[PDB]
Amino acid sequence: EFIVGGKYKLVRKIGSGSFGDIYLAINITNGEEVAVKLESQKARHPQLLYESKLYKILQGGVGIPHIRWYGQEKDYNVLVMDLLGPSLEDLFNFCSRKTVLMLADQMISRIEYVHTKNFIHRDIKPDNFLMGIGRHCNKLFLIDFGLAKKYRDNRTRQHIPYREDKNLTGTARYASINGIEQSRRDDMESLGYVLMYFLKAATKKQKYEKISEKKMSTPVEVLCPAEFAMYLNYCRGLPDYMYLRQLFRILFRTLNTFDWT
Amino acid sequence: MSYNYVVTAQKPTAVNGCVTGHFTSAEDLNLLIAKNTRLEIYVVTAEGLRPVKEVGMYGKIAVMELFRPKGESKDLLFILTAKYNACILEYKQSGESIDIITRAHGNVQDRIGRPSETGIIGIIDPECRMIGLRLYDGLFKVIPLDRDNKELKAFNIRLEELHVIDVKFLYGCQAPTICFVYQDPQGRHVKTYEVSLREKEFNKGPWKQENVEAEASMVIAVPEPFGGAIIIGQESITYHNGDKYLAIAPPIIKQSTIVCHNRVDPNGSRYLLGDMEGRLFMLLLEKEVTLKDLRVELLGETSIAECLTYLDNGVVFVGSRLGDSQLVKLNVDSNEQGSYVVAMETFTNLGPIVDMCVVDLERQGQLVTCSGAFKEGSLRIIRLHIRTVPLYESPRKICYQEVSQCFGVLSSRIEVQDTSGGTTALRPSASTQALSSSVSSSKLFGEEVEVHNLLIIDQHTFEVLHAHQFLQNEYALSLVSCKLGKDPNTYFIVGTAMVYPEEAEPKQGRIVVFQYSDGKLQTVAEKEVKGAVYSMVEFNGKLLASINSTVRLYEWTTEKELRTECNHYNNIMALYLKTKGDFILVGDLMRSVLLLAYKPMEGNFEEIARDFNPNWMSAVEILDDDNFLGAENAFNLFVCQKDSATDEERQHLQEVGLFHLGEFVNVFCHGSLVMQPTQGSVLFGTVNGMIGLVTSLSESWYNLLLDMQNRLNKVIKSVGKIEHSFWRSFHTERKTEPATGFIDGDLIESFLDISRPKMQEVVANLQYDDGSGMKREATADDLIKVVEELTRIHWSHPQFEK
Amino acid sequence: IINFDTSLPTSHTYLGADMEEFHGRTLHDDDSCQVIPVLPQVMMILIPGQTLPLQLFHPQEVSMVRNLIQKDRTFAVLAYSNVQEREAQFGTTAEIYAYREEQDFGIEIVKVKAIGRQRFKVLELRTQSDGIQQAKVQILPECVLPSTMSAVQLESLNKCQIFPSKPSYKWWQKYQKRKFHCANLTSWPRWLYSLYDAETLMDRIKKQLREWDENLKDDSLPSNPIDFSYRVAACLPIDDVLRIQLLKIGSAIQRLRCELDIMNKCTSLCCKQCQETEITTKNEIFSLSLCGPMAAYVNPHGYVHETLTVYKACNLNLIGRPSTEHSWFPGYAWTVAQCKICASHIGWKFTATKKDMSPQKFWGLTRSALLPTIP
Ligand SMILES: N#Cc1ccc(NC(=O)Nc2ncccc2OCc2ccccc2)c(O)c1
Ligand SMILES: O=C1CC[C@@H](N2Cc3cc(NC(=O)c4ccccc4)ccc3C2=O)C(=O)N1
Ligand SMILES: [Zn+2]
């Protein structure tokens, strides 16, 4: 049986259709349930090292896991971490399809940490959020950092110069305006579309560009509190995100546990 | 070194047994005194004791009895040694020549079994039909006394009772009957058995009883016509004979425990009792055929007695181990209270020797020892010529200060708790009758406490000049006299500990420095330590101290203080501490030898070698840079050496010498010329009062003496026909091994005592590597010269018999 | 330890209560050269008298155990100085008293319970062709020493050398005064001789243990000095070098003295990776088993853990849900405990299922992840 580094044992499958199928490993010396992302040495998408590096540069926080072991085993590269749990997405659609905005500020707090840690996730979807298990049952964790752009450069983090005519498919339903390179503003703009979320075809010019143009055809006020709709607008105007956080705390307090809990 | 020589300077003086009877002749009363390995025979005359014969045994005498079987002219002697050699001996005299004839001999050891904790018991029945030995728990060994039993064949019977205290043979029985007292979880009981030699089994005894005191220890077999037994306990004295029962609880015997007895009248009318303090009692049995009552009276005070014997004319022999043996007279009248004792003769006992020193080496050394305990403690000055200085308390440690011309003695006395919260002394002692007295600090039932003192003694008159009393609950352990640092003054340094009954391991102690100047003793400096200072030595102008398990080196500052230089931590306690140059020898009570060196440049301690073998150790010494001496469990000597031919072997000490001495060594000293081919000179003192000399030989001399020893064993007749090789073998309960690296000087010096034809037989075919260079057939004269040169390394014993 | 049975953890019921039980002994004579097989996976220091559970998976170990069952049932547990190069100087002989075999999952499993018997010294290690290790072994002796007074005692007091049995501070005063009466014939006092007396050392150890753990029944400890010392050494939560040091000791008195020295030196268990955080204190250690606070258990995959049972632990992180499968202590569910700093495996937290039991929450910690601090 596949023993990861002579210490773990892959018992079953928990997620697939991904770059790294996320297995459930078990420590043959401890008994702990473990999450293992496994990718081939000749796989088409080598995001395993990408996400491991992003976890490594994360190094702590209430939303970033701990890498138990990395390296490689024969033709299948491996990443062992703590068993994350259930996805925020696979909790919102399983439960029933205050909780929304209490989570949102937890997400908002998460992104300050990644922005202050000199990089960007850039791939925000409800799938990439996962609730913890046990002690972490109430804490948000952002994962799937394989598609996360690193702004670390020489000395202090320097945003790379913007380059027009760029493509984005990782955020299929949250692409929005993003030629404009994904950045801090682009992170928080996808969050507002995730909060909002809380005619296709094979041609991409109709399945992505038409969605984006309909997304920005009308102001956010008609689609939507309109006050936090215009917060979204002026958040996309991008410094300001500290202000946006204090304003969102004000909104959270001015409304007089979560869905599944 | 690797080859050593052991000789006896003073024979043991302590008495462990004594019997009376008719051994030399049927018309003469004889006293036989058993000292360690030495048997002395005396004839009882009106003037006193007349010595006739003294013999040496190849063993420690444990059992000594006199019996007269049917058809024999006089008494025969039964001896059992601590190595289980059993012999029956006869006294024969043909004109001037006197010999001890061996009638039967053998070894009665059992290959399996644990030795009894209460010891070895040997009894002979009044009808002279068997011998009963209690050697191992649960077994009783019987030796038939038929004429045709010359190898001493014995058989074992099983005892249901595992913990036996005492056992005796009863008088007036048709079959051999034994009576004994045993202990079980219920208490202590008295039981009897009958011994059948045909069936080799135990039969049912004539009577059984249960009412025995919880502190009963002694069984006394009363002869005819009374019969029965007397059981002596801490509070009561009882007489049991079938349905008869008598008990008394005299208030006079509660103070101390009765440890010895003897019979005065042939019919058991009177008995002598002695206790642990020196009181002599009389036990009187009243008669109508049958016994009426028991009475006890106090006779007086003698030495602390190990054994008592009556000499048929009102004279009693007191055989002591803690002090001098006495001959006393029992008078019908008295001085204060009825029937006192009067001393008439005193015999020297140097044991126990707990410490000693060598003084006046300018011109011929002298030995000063701390001897005795309790009221028998004294100082002995040995030149043999012996001088006694009674202290009336216990001497512990001693040292000599030449500048002050005085001795420093550590002592202790026993005081009892009075109602007033203080303590009261039992007798006037040296520490209470000193010229000048001082205390460290002043502080305020029937419980005994120990008070420790430091005594200053003049070297000419041996009077007490100054006594210093230490703190309450303080136990003084070490004492040195030395000069420290650049100070031109000589100091007395004492290492103490604080001992509280509720604490197992002492956590406090101190080192105190005293100076004796202008007739007074003053305190210069004191240092508080967090342990017990077991030993101290002078290390190249510094002070080496052993606190609990660590070794500390101190420096003497110009401000008159002790400053710590380096610490070394061990897993063992440093009970023993010796020094030669830059080397330090460390040892504990479990025979763990550690060799350390001082690195002067680095200022710390380095470990050179070690040897860990679990056994009980009593003393160690340094012979030279490589070889070290020690004393083992049982009564043994060992020698270890280093670097004999990687770091595994260089850090290991191996045993190059093993020997069975027969004595318990307490102290080693370098007495180079105490008594004015051999190298070095070390003296040791034992519990039995024996003083010995250890010197080092060369290869050639060792080989010659070993060959001569082997030849002498074939020509010298031993008493009991014990083999010298078996006697000198290293002995432990788990191991037995032949002796290596040691020459027995007593056997070598016995060569001068044999006849000339026997000398010719010994010296035949011996190749002598004379100083000329070429080996030639040795003659008796050359070996006589060698042996006389060997005897010159110690004094000469005087004649014993008249 | 109320309404809970202390004998349950000793039977190791998680392996199967239908073992084949073997009665009989085999003691090798002292100081002899013998060849004994070595199990290649065991990395434990075995103290004599200690129980070792094993689950063996590889075919060579199964063949070795099957051969051993028919012949003297002894294998060697080597106390490795460092497991890196598989070198060791001393070890112990273990004897099998329980054995069963299962053909589950298409493979062969052998379950063994073993007890330690004798200490030895390693002369030579041979790794023969098949892939197992046979060692040349010299059997170390057990040193029994008589009383210290057996060299100075006068024969007269030897009659009173036995004393009436125990009914006790006054009693121990009397015991010291009367047993070592002849200490004045030597250079040392009575308390020094008491410091080397096995009975007194055992009494002191029992007093200390009862002060730390009050539920300690009087008769739970053996009455023999050798067995007492071996049990105490087995139950002490110390590191490998100290266990090797205790295994090298041949005398029971020295072993007792070393154990007292270990106990007296202040200790608070800390994480091995961090060496800065304190997991538990010696006050919160209790004996949920008849063996004591520490014992050896085996997990489903054949790894032996030495678990220390403590009432309370600090700075531990719990991962996962309480699972009741394969629990070493019946009636409890375990949750994995990691260090709050280094995130290394320290042990488990056991929460009971019923409500009439006691205690309901406690912690089990592995010795290999614990380090004793000495100030
Ligand atoms: N049968 C049996 C039996 C044998 C042994 C034991 N206990 C023990 O060994 N140590 C023990 N116990 C309870 C509380 C504290 C304890 O020391 C903790 C400790 C000691 C040394 C270093 C560091 C920590 C028992 O409770 C039963
Ligand atoms: O008291 C105790 C005793 C048991 C002890 N375990 C339990 C355990 C299970 C495991 N996984 C498994 O078997 C397992 C389960 C499902 C599929 C594949 C494997 C691994 C290690 C440990 C381990 O060490 C523990 O945790 N606490
Ligand atoms: Zn840690």
mmCIF file with all atom_site columns, N, CA, C and O and ligand atoms in Angstrom, chain A residues 9 11 26-31, chain C residues 299-301 305 325-328 334 348 350, ligand 2:
data_model
loop_
_atom_site.group_PDB
_atom_site.id
_atom_site.type_symbol
_atom_site.label_atom_id
_atom_site.label_alt_id
_atom_site.label_comp_id
_atom_site.label_asym_id
_atom_site.label_entity_id
_atom_site.label_seq_id
_atom_site.pdbx_PDB_ins_code
_atom_site.Cartn_x
_atom_site.Cartn_y
_atom_site.Cartn_z
_atom_site.occupancy
_atom_site.B_iso_or_equiv
_atom_site.pdbx_formal_charge
_atom_site.auth_seq_id
_atom_site.auth_comp_id
_atom_site.auth_asym_id
_atom_site.auth_atom_id
_atom_site.pdbx_PDB_model_num
ATOM   1   N N   . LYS A 1 9   ? -0.492  6.650  5.493  1.00 0.00 ? 9   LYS A N   1
ATOM   2   C CA  . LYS A 1 9   ? -1.214  5.630  4.734  1.00 0.00 ? 9   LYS A CA  1
ATOM   3   C C   . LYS A 1 9   ? -2.482  6.231  4.147  1.00 0.00 ? 9   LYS A C   1
ATOM   4   O O   . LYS A 1 9   ? -3.373  6.646  4.893  1.00 0.00 ? 9   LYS A O   1
ATOM   5   N N   . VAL A 1 11  ? -5.930  6.273  2.866  1.00 0.00 ? 11  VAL A N   1
ATOM   6   C CA  . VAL A 1 11  ? -7.038  5.345  3.067  1.00 0.00 ? 11  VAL A CA  1
ATOM   7   C C   . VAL A 1 11  ? -8.142  5.537  2.032  1.00 0.00 ? 11  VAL A C   1
ATOM   8   O O   . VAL A 1 11  ? -8.740  4.560  1.576  1.00 0.00 ? 11  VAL A O   1
ATOM   9   N N   . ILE A 1 26  ? -3.123  8.569  7.252  1.00 0.00 ? 26  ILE A N   1
ATOM   10  C CA  . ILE A 1 26  ? -3.189  8.196  8.659  1.00 0.00 ? 26  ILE A CA  1
ATOM   11  C C   . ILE A 1 26  ? -1.776  7.912  9.151  1.00 0.00 ? 26  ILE A C   1
ATOM   12  O O   . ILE A 1 26  ? -1.030  7.167  8.509  1.00 0.00 ? 26  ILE A O   1
ATOM   13  N N   . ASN A 1 27  ? -1.407  8.509  10.280 1.00 0.00 ? 27  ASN A N   1
ATOM   14  C CA  . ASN A 1 27  ? -0.070  8.335  10.831 1.00 0.00 ? 27  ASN A CA  1
ATOM   15  C C   . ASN A 1 27  ? 0.022   6.965  11.493 1.00 0.00 ? 27  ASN A C   1
ATOM   16  O O   . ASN A 1 27  ? -0.703  6.682  12.453 1.00 0.00 ? 27  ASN A O   1
ATOM   17  N N   . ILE A 1 28  ? 0.909   6.114  10.982 1.00 0.00 ? 28  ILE A N   1
ATOM   18  C CA  . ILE A 1 28  ? 1.042   4.746  11.473 1.00 0.00 ? 28  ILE A CA  1
ATOM   19  C C   . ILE A 1 28  ? 1.726   4.703  12.834 1.00 0.00 ? 28  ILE A C   1
ATOM   20  O O   . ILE A 1 28  ? 1.862   3.631  13.431 1.00 0.00 ? 28  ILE A O   1
ATOM   21  N N   . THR A 1 29  ? 2.168   5.857  13.337 1.00 0.00 ? 29  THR A N   1
ATOM   22  C CA  . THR A 1 29  ? 2.736   5.928  14.675 1.00 0.00 ? 29  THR A CA  1
ATOM   23  C C   . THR A 1 29  ? 1.899   6.737  15.656 1.00 0.00 ? 29  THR A C   1
ATOM   24  O O   . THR A 1 29  ? 2.108   6.607  16.864 1.00 0.00 ? 29  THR A O   1
ATOM   25  N N   . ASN A 1 30  ? 0.972   7.562  15.178 1.00 0.00 ? 30  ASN A N   1
ATOM   26  C CA  . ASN A 1 30  ? 0.172   8.411  16.053 1.00 0.00 ? 30  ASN A CA  1
ATOM   27  C C   . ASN A 1 30  ? -1.315  8.101  15.990 1.00 0.00 ? 30  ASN A C   1
ATOM   28  O O   . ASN A 1 30  ? -1.943  7.901  17.034 1.00 0.00 ? 30  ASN A O   1
ATOM   29  N N   . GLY A 1 31  ? -1.901  8.057  14.798 1.00 0.00 ? 31  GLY A N   1
ATOM   30  C CA  . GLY A 1 31  ? -3.327  7.852  14.648 1.00 0.00 ? 31  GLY A CA  1
ATOM   31  C C   . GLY A 1 31  ? -4.099  9.051  14.154 1.00 0.00 ? 31  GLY A C   1
ATOM   32  O O   . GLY A 1 31  ? -5.333  9.036  14.206 1.00 0.00 ? 31  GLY A O   1
ATOM   33  N N   . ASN C 2 299 ? 0.275   -0.253 19.156 1.00 0.00 ? 299 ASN C N   1
ATOM   34  C CA  . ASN C 2 299 ? -0.777  0.326  18.332 1.00 0.00 ? 299 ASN C CA  1
ATOM   35  C C   . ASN C 2 299 ? -1.149  -0.640 17.214 1.00 0.00 ? 299 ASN C C   1
ATOM   36  O O   . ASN C 2 299 ? -0.536  -1.699 17.067 1.00 0.00 ? 299 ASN C O   1
ATOM   37  N N   . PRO C 2 300 ? -2.173  -0.323 16.411 1.00 0.00 ? 300 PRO C N   1
ATOM   38  C CA  . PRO C 2 300 ? -2.567  -1.259 15.343 1.00 0.00 ? 300 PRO C CA  1
ATOM   39  C C   . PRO C 2 300 ? -1.459  -1.591 14.355 1.00 0.00 ? 300 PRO C C   1
ATOM   40  O O   . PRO C 2 300 ? -1.504  -2.664 13.741 1.00 0.00 ? 300 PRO C O   1
ATOM   41  N N   . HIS C 2 301 ? -0.469  -0.719 14.176 1.00 0.00 ? 301 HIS C N   1
ATOM   42  C CA  . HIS C 2 301 ? 0.577   -0.935 13.186 1.00 0.00 ? 301 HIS C CA  1
ATOM   43  C C   . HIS C 2 301 ? 1.895   -1.394 13.805 1.00 0.00 ? 301 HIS C C   1
ATOM   44  O O   . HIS C 2 301 ? 2.943   -1.289 13.160 1.00 0.00 ? 301 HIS C O   1
ATOM   45  N N   . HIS C 2 305 ? 4.477   2.203  22.287 1.00 0.00 ? 305 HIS C N   1
ATOM   46  C CA  . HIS C 2 305 ? 4.522   3.477  22.986 1.00 0.00 ? 305 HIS C CA  1
ATOM   47  C C   . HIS C 2 305 ? 4.507   3.233  24.486 1.00 0.00 ? 305 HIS C C   1
ATOM   48  O O   . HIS C 2 305 ? 3.809   2.340  24.973 1.00 0.00 ? 305 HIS C O   1
ATOM   49  N N   . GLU C 2 325 ? -11.806 3.359  18.972 1.00 0.00 ? 325 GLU C N   1
ATOM   50  C CA  . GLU C 2 325 ? -11.267 2.134  18.405 1.00 0.00 ? 325 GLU C CA  1
ATOM   51  C C   . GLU C 2 325 ? -9.884  1.828  18.966 1.00 0.00 ? 325 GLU C C   1
ATOM   52  O O   . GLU C 2 325 ? -9.043  2.719  19.119 1.00 0.00 ? 325 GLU C O   1
ATOM   53  N N   . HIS C 2 326 ? -9.660  0.554  19.288 1.00 0.00 ? 326 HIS C N   1
ATOM   54  C CA  . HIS C 2 326 ? -8.357  0.025  19.687 1.00 0.00 ? 326 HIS C CA  1
ATOM   55  C C   . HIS C 2 326 ? -7.788  0.724  20.917 1.00 0.00 ? 326 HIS C C   1
ATOM   56  O O   . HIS C 2 326 ? -6.573  0.731  21.117 1.00 0.00 ? 326 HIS C O   1
ATOM   57  N N   . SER C 2 327 ? -8.644  1.305  21.755 1.00 0.00 ? 327 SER C N   1
ATOM   58  C CA  . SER C 2 327 ? -8.168  2.058  22.909 1.00 0.00 ? 327 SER C CA  1
ATOM   59  C C   . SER C 2 327 ? -7.439  1.152  23.893 1.00 0.00 ? 327 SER C C   1
ATOM   60  O O   . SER C 2 327 ? -7.890  0.044  24.197 1.00 0.00 ? 327 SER C O   1
ATOM   61  N N   . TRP C 2 328 ? -6.299  1.635  24.391 1.00 0.00 ? 328 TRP C N   1
ATOM   62  C CA  . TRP C 2 328 ? -5.528  0.869  25.364 1.00 0.00 ? 328 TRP C CA  1
ATOM   63  C C   . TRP C 2 328 ? -6.274  0.750  26.686 1.00 0.00 ? 328 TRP C C   1
ATOM   64  O O   . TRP C 2 328 ? -6.203  -0.288 27.353 1.00 0.00 ? 328 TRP C O   1
ATOM   65  N N   . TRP C 2 334 ? -9.856  8.363  22.578 1.00 0.00 ? 334 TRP C N   1
ATOM   66  C CA  . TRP C 2 334 ? -8.617  9.121  22.521 1.00 0.00 ? 334 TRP C CA  1
ATOM   67  C C   . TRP C 2 334 ? -8.656  10.171 21.417 1.00 0.00 ? 334 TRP C C   1
ATOM   68  O O   . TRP C 2 334 ? -9.277  9.978  20.369 1.00 0.00 ? 334 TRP C O   1
ATOM   69  N N   . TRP C 2 348 ? -2.118  11.584 23.876 1.00 0.00 ? 348 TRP C N   1
ATOM   70  C CA  . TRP C 2 348 ? -3.549  11.557 23.620 1.00 0.00 ? 348 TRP C CA  1
ATOM   71  C C   . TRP C 2 348 ? -4.293  12.093 24.835 1.00 0.00 ? 348 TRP C C   1
ATOM   72  O O   . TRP C 2 348 ? -3.746  12.184 25.935 1.00 0.00 ? 348 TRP C O   1
ATOM   73  N N   . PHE C 2 350 ? -7.902  11.206 26.825 1.00 0.00 ? 350 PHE C N   1
ATOM   74  C CA  . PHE C 2 350 ? -8.921  10.172 26.939 1.00 0.00 ? 350 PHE C CA  1
ATOM   75  C C   . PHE C 2 350 ? -10.145 10.749 27.635 1.00 0.00 ? 350 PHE C C   1
ATOM   76  O O   . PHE C 2 350 ? -10.049 11.246 28.761 1.00 0.00 ? 350 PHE C O   1
HETATM 77  O O1  . LIG D 3 .   ? -5.021  4.268  23.301 1.00 0.00 ? 2   LIG D O1  1
HETATM 78  C C1  . LIG D 3 .   ? -4.700  4.250  22.162 1.00 0.00 ? 2   LIG D C1  1
HETATM 79  C C2  . LIG D 3 .   ? -4.469  2.943  21.408 1.00 0.00 ? 2   LIG D C2  1
HETATM 80  C C3  . LIG D 3 .   ? -4.438  3.049  19.936 1.00 0.00 ? 2   LIG D C3  1
HETATM 81  C C4  . LIG D 3 .   ? -3.539  4.130  19.494 1.00 0.00 ? 2   LIG D C4  1
HETATM 82  N N1  . LIG D 3 .   ? -3.527  4.199  18.048 1.00 0.00 ? 2   LIG D N1  1
HETATM 83  C C5  . LIG D 3 .   ? -4.687  3.991  17.216 1.00 0.00 ? 2   LIG D C5  1
HETATM 84  C C6  . LIG D 3 .   ? -4.253  4.149  15.753 1.00 0.00 ? 2   LIG D C6  1
HETATM 85  C C7  . LIG D 3 .   ? -4.977  4.048  14.557 1.00 0.00 ? 2   LIG D C7  1
HETATM 86  C C8  . LIG D 3 .   ? -4.329  4.237  13.347 1.00 0.00 ? 2   LIG D C8  1
HETATM 87  N N2  . LIG D 3 .   ? -5.080  4.139  12.113 1.00 0.00 ? 2   LIG D N2  1
HETATM 88  C C9  . LIG D 3 .   ? -5.677  2.896  11.680 1.00 0.00 ? 2   LIG D C9  1
HETATM 89  O O2  . LIG D 3 .   ? -5.567  1.912  12.329 1.00 0.00 ? 2   LIG D O2  1
HETATM 90  C C10 . LIG D 3 .   ? -6.451  2.880  10.368 1.00 0.00 ? 2   LIG D C10 1
HETATM 91  C C11 . LIG D 3 .   ? -7.806  3.154  10.365 1.00 0.00 ? 2   LIG D C11 1
HETATM 92  C C12 . LIG D 3 .   ? -8.510  3.143  9.172  1.00 0.00 ? 2   LIG D C12 1
HETATM 93  C C13 . LIG D 3 .   ? -7.854  2.864  7.987  1.00 0.00 ? 2   LIG D C13 1
HETATM 94  C C14 . LIG D 3 .   ? -6.494  2.595  7.991  1.00 0.00 ? 2   LIG D C14 1
HETATM 95  C C15 . LIG D 3 .   ? -5.792  2.605  9.183  1.00 0.00 ? 2   LIG D C15 1
HETATM 96  C C16 . LIG D 3 .   ? -2.964  4.533  13.315 1.00 0.00 ? 2   LIG D C16 1
HETATM 97  C C17 . LIG D 3 .   ? -2.244  4.630  14.503 1.00 0.00 ? 2   LIG D C17 1
HETATM 98  C C18 . LIG D 3 .   ? -2.901  4.440  15.730 1.00 0.00 ? 2   LIG D C18 1
HETATM 99  C C19 . LIG D 3 .   ? -2.399  4.480  17.187 1.00 0.00 ? 2   LIG D C19 1
HETATM 100 O O3  . LIG D 3 .   ? -1.290  4.702  17.533 1.00 0.00 ? 2   LIG D O3  1
HETATM 101 C C20 . LIG D 3 .   ? -4.071  5.478  19.933 1.00 0.00 ? 2   LIG D C20 1
HETATM 102 O O4  . LIG D 3 .   ? -4.163  6.411  19.212 1.00 0.00 ? 2   LIG D O4  1
HETATM 103 N N3  . LIG D 3 .   ? -4.473  5.503  21.373 1.00 0.00 ? 2   LIG D N3  1
#
